[PDB]
Design a protein around this nucleic acid. Sequence first.
RNA 1: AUAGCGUAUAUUAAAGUUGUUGCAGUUAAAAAGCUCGUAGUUGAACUUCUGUUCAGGUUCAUUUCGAUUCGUCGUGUGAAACU
RNA 2: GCAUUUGCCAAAGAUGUUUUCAUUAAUCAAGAACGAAAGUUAGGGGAUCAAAGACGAUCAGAUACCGUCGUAGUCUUAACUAUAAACUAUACCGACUCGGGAUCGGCUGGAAUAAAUGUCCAGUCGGCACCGUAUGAGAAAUCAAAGUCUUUGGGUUCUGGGGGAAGUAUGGUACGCAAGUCUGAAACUUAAAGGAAUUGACGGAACAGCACACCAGAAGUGGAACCUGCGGCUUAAUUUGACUCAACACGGGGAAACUCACGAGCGCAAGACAGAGAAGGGAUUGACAGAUUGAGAGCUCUUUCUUGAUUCUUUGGGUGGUGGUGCAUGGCCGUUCUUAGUUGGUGGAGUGAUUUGUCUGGUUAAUUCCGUUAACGAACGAGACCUUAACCUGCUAACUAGUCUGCUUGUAAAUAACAGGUUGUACUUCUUAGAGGGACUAUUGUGCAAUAAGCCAAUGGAAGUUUAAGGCAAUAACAGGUCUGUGAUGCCCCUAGACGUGCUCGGCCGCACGCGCGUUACAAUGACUGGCGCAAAAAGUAUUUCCUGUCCUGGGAAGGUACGGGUAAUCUUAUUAAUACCAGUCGUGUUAGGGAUAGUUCUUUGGAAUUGUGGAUCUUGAACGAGGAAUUUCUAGUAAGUGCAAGUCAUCAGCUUGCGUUGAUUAU
Lengths: 119, 229
Amino acid sequence: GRVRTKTVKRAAKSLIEHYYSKLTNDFHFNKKILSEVAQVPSKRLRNKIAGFATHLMKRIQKGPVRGISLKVQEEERERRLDYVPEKSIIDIEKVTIDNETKEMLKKLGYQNIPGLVSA
Amino acid sequence: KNDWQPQTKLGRLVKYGKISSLDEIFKYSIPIKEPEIIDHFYPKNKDVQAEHKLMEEVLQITPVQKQTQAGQRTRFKGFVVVGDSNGHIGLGWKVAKEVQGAIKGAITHAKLNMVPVRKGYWGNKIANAHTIPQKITGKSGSVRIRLVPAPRGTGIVAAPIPKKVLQFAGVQDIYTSSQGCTRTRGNFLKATYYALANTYRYLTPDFWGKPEDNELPFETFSEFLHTKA
RNA sequence: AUAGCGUAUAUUAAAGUUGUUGCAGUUAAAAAGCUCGUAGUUGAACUUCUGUUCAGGUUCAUUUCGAUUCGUCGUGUGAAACU
RNA sequence: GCAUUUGCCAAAGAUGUUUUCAUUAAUCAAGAACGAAAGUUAGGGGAUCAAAGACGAUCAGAUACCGUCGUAGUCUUAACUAUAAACUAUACCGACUCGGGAUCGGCUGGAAUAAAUGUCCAGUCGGCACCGUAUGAGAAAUCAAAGUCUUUGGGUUCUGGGGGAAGUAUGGUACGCAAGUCUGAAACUUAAAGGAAUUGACGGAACAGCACACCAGAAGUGGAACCUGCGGCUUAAUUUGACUCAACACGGGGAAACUCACGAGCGCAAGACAGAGAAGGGAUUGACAGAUUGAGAGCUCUUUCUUGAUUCUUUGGGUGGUGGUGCAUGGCCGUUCUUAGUUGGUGGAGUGAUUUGUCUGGUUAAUUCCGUUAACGAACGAGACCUUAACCUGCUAACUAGUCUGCUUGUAAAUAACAGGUUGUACUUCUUAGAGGGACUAUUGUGCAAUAAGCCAAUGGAAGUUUAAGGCAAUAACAGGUCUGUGAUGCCCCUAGACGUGCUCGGCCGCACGCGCGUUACAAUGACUGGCGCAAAAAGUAUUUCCUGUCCUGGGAAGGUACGGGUAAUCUUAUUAAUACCAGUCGUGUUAGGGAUAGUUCUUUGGAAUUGUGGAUCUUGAACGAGGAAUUUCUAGUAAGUGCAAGUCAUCAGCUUGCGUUGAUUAU
Ligand SMILES: [Mg+2]
Ligand SMILES: [Mg+2]
Ligand SMILES: [Mg+2]
Ligand SMILES: [Mg+2]
Ligand SMILES: [Mg+2]
Ligand SMILES: [Mg+2]
Ligand SMILES: [Mg+2]
Ligand SMILES: [Mg+2]
Ligand SMILES: [Mg+2]
Ligand SMILES: [Mg+2]
Ligand SMILES: [Mg+2]
Ligand SMILES: [Mg+2]
Ligand SMILES: [Mg+2]
Ligand SMILES: [Mg+2]
Ligand SMILES: [Mg+2]
Ligand SMILES: [Mg+2]
Ligand SMILES: [Mg+2]
Ligand SMILES: [Mg+2]
Ligand SMILES: [Mg+2]
Ligand SMILES: [Mg+2]
Ligand SMILES: [Mg+2]
Ligand SMILES: [Mg+2]
Ligand SMILES: [Mg+2]
Ligand SMILES: [Mg+2]
Ligand SMILES: [Mg+2]
Ligand SMILES: [Mg+2]
Ligand SMILES: [Mg+2]
Ligand SMILES: [Mg+2]
């Protein structure tokens, strides 16, 4: 019966959304953070929200999470993903062509363009 | 909150007094979803003599029934015509559980549905196009309406309903023909409306030449739109 | 409505509910169980195409003009379908 | 309509043609060939089934569905008959409008091999179809035609004109042996009949949820006596509402008077207010006393004395009514249901009612969430919220709580032990209870989850079943209940020997019986006799009246009034409960189990106890030996047992609402 409700998940989304840089794996920290940050009419409520938000911090540490878009952390993550060697895969001066590709090149007349190796 | 904040690009372009005329919107075929854009071009300062006075009329109000979880749940449908007698007409309809509600929503609908009737000449072309360029046809559900152009001062020869529509369009002189179950008022109205709309769809011989090539308002006004208000 | 106005009955529009113009026929009434076939109705394409010149009007257009006038006339020049 | 092998006979399409003819064609009243089954005529044949029929069964009835039989038929020669939902319910010839694979038959190239009447590939012509799709059609279902239709004309036959009457009547030098076929009316009557589709409701259809619904169990009711409701039946009267959950220990419905509506007999007017008459030279009230009466009811009658408009007689008419009508109504309250449901905006789909949202699937107690997603976001309901219970050796304090410290007192060798009495710039563990903490499913988990919601386990934790138990309860209903809770009422009824307001006696408790809640038992896990410093929560005096503590008397229930406290954290009391425990009796039998029912006595509440209000003492001791068909409630301090309070209340708990004590079996 421990399923969590609309109010709570909307709340948690928001709290992470604005505050992710302030937030900890510790419930007891995040609950105080929430308390300062927000108007929450109940102790019980705040605690449920804080717990779920903590849960989602942990889920975020592992990877992408549906429903929450942290653009700062996502752009950092994007720059993370780029790595480029100097050679690429793409070698203009040496390129390999199938038999059929060759037939279509004959059709266009491009069969002889510099650096083309048939296979 | 009696001030309109546009949610449409076109809405901005209209409120800030940028797009010139209504017909221009019609020309560039820019979708109107905002029932404000229309009240814009029709000023409420109330000068009694303009034929550009925008008119609203409730046509239908229907007690529609539903059988739901052992209850019988009624709402109201309504049909509404909007037009200036000069060239422009729209038809709308709305379902709601309160009458005046159905009416308001249907007025709004009808405005979103504004359409440019074309006016032609019967015989020799002298002054006021009193009628349609061709004969054309509305089709809704079973119903069909045919609009045939009439000579000067013939007046509108047509049933009470399509007559009302046509008068709102500002067709002065016309001949009518109707097929189908015409007592279905929504279909009759719809038909007449669609018919009236097809006036501009018809490629008549005078439309044959190369048209003007203009840039869309949005491309011209691109600078305006990307300022942040 | 009005010195007139009700009612009954046949007939006309309403009726694209007789349909040539002009209706319908899978399920609302409606394609014949199926073929052959005479009357009836219905029927593929080809023949002096075309071009050149003249004239007469009749239309049209108008950066040709004119005259006068509340709009016709004369004239251009070309452009038509004619005859 | 046609499905075994082979042979024969004539026929056919499609394809292939640089073959021939040359408009020879399309459709079609006449007129013709066919034409399932069933049926008919004359012969055959007859195995299977099988109308009719004979029987069994089923059933209220079955001349039916089921079963055992069985004739005509079914098969066959010659003949008739001409009909079907003879169905794509879709006329034929011809064009033209999308895309895609596949299929059957020809042909044309190409490719592989094990080199062929076989494969594969690419074309194409013709068939049967299918799948997408239409900015084409349609009322829609749907349709590649059902498209190229008011932008209405390629050619040609046929058929329809609201529903029934009726494919009936009638006529057929139309047919048939017959059955019948073909042709085919009108009178009359009627506002609908009809088509598609939507939403409900329903289903003796399919699937999926949820609940003590069932499952694993428990306690049992149903069997007995009694108690208390219903119904019957008596009755002067047995007042009455309420009949499946959703009536029936329900109407706070435990009624001796009262209550109280029922019944028998008596009294009052509190019959205002207005009009008419009467009244001051008297309207009217009262009352000794004798009768009278149940009654010191002046009710009545005789008897007069008082009294002094408080008004009397009519005519209108108001008060009053536990009289009717919940199907006239408010308000409140039950129930579907505490189930998880219900809306709207803007976008998407329909001509439209409507639909999507609001869902395949997981997940939750939950349309709780996750995810899917032509939907995006929201509102109500659920959750949250609120009350009670559980954690604080930390805070704030307490003589209307307690602890300790120091004094003392008693029993004792007593800086022993156990008890009192005192005490303080003392203290907060216990006790109040204010502030604030605390739980969020926390931590961990190569546990299950498509790693998402979530579930699971272990650890920590006062607490991890939504912490536990509750309060609140959307949209819609159900002519549910309530005129008898209301000085909330519409309408109806009764208005002076009143259906008004009183008084006296009955009645609601009357018993052959039927049906519900329930208390108590059938005993040994027991009954009885002693002993035993174990609760919680409630109450409480307009002063003697309310809780009641001492004390005394009585064998007892109970009485004194002798001394007292308390409008209460101070007093009853922080006790006085009962299961339980320890001894001892009794010994598996209607036994002391069990006590219904009865007869004397005594006491208490009440003017009143008889028709036993309760309580006490001796007797008296029934049914019942664990309960047929049925069937209720229930998952943890829970069931069950066990007492206690509160409501009622002068007295009367077998009821209700609560309170703790002892504490499970089994699921989860
Ligand atoms: Mg019509
Ligand atoms: Mg039919
Ligand atoms: Mg010809
Ligand atoms: Mg025979
Ligand atoms: Mg029988
Ligand atoms: Mg047989
Ligand atoms: Mg080949
Ligand atoms: Mg049609
Ligand atoms: Mg359409
Ligand atoms: Mg299709
Ligand atoms: Mg046509
Ligand atoms: Mg009673
Ligand atoms: Mg009254
Ligand atoms: Mg009374
Ligand atoms: Mg909507
Ligand atoms: Mg919409
Ligand atoms: Mg629409
Ligand atoms: Mg729905
Ligand atoms: Mg679900
Ligand atoms: Mg939503
Ligand atoms: Mg709860
Ligand atoms: Mg009733
Ligand atoms: Mg006493
Ligand atoms: Mg007490
Ligand atoms: Mg007695
Ligand atoms: Mg007794
Ligand atoms: Mg008492
Ligand atoms: Mg009671």
